[PDB]
Amino acid sequence: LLIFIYLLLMAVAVFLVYQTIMDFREKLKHPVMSVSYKEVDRYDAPGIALYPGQAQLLSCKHYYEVIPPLRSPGQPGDVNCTTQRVNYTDPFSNQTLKSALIVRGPREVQKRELVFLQFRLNQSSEDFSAIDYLLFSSFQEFLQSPDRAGFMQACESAYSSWKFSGGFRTWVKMSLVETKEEDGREAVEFRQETSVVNYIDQRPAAEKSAQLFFVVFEWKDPFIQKVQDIITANPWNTIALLCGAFLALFKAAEFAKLSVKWMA
Template sequence: MFSDEQGEEIPDICKEDELGELDPSESKDTLPEAEDDAVVSYPLMGFDRACLKNILSTLLMFIYLALTTVAVFLAYQTITDFMEKLNHPVLSVRYEEVDCFEPAGIALYLGKAHLLSCKHHNHDHIPPLVSPGQPEIGDCVTEEVTYKAPYSNHTSRRALVVQGPTDVRKRELVFLQFSQNETEADFSAISYMLFSRFSDLMSSGDKSGFMQDCEKNYSMWTFSGGFRTWVKMSLVKTSGTTVDSVEFRQESSVVKYNDKRPEEEKLNQLFFIVFQWRDPFIQEVRNIVTANPWNTIAILCGVFMALFKAANFAKLSIEWMIKIRKRHRKRQKLAGVS
């Protein structure tokens, strides 16, 4: 064991001197002199350069372990964020302005009601009713379709499909009147459904099947008798990851009809409904996946490269420490022989 001038024992980690390995050809008589020179070269606190190297190597090993832990956590967090963004796409909303819409299909399920008139008007102008409750000549394009209900093959449904308005700049609207004989029911209403293009029905080779699909994919609404229901439509197109869809949103207002007919004519209840586009904008909603696989791969490559470099550094540090230990044991052995 080496000692300093005050007789303090030097730790084993610090017993490597700065003279390097001894040449085996040196005589044993020179060892005491070299030993004295090594003892003199130690600082007062008993630490030499080899000791400092061992301490720094140990410290660097701890730093390597800390960096490895951080790199593994970063890789895990990167993969987790990528999967989260992949499974939860962000909704992007864009508005497309148009001058004219594709005429929508308005499917009316009248039941016992009858269509009295259907007319197109512009600029929100609806002329006063001349003969309410009486059939009038209209200018609408209609198509009647009978088909099986999609969820019950034993139920037959009859739909009167009307071509909707197109010119949104002139605020074109469609005004429809219906009548229905008074029944014992407590409430009376007519159901209707909107689908995106009336032309799709007219060009379809299987109109019954087309209406079945529409009933599966579109919502149903109703309007009541004795009121004028004004429906303002807006179109929403949704682009998903696999399937695109079109739906309607509505803003409706209801006004009571002041029936001035004679009492005997009031047995036929009247229905009024107006369809109009709300504004010239089509809302397009898209599901956007913000997860970029290339960015994730680049981050992971950087992390793994850093781990590889750190592992290589740790390997070299361990080999260096082993080499120092061997030199230290060799010097102890030579010192003991002397």
């Protein structure tokens, strides 16, 4: 025959523990995500894996904020960069042989360094001509690799590949996104946005049968976007909250006993 507020206190404690456990579980289920920007003065030389079927690389150069007009739009020019060639097997199906021409991408961003590439496909029956390209983080990391074919088979799964069509000048603005996985993977990936500009075919009609591919690679900005996942569920903070609530309840019970022995 007392106040019996201990029952209400126990109910409050049970409810608070239950809601705290539910909150911790739902916070552990749904991590939040954070984005930051790391400014880099000079990117590492990216690798550009082009896939020309039969078109030959007429020209390739390292340009700057402007490209001078082509002296010969559709004739063999000058290749003026470090390019390699690799042959590997497509991870999707082991019955196809893929030949990749690897180009060292532009490093300088403050100066807006460009990689300008021009291919010509002489004759083909394909209705929609297009050259595929893949981007990987470092060309140097590709050079000193024991298994170049294995490197490219890994890059096929690690990165997504796009394509640029003939009759255009595809201007590819590429940027780096580093996703720091919960396992500390630090997976680096490429994002890119294009702008296709028509090619004014001024060549004589005799040579108009051949198709011309122009593509320009640069970095859109000297910022690498780092994306991380943050776990908002901290067990120790939960323990501290539970301890504080339990202490508050215990002191409330003590004050209730004091009130009972004073007035009630």
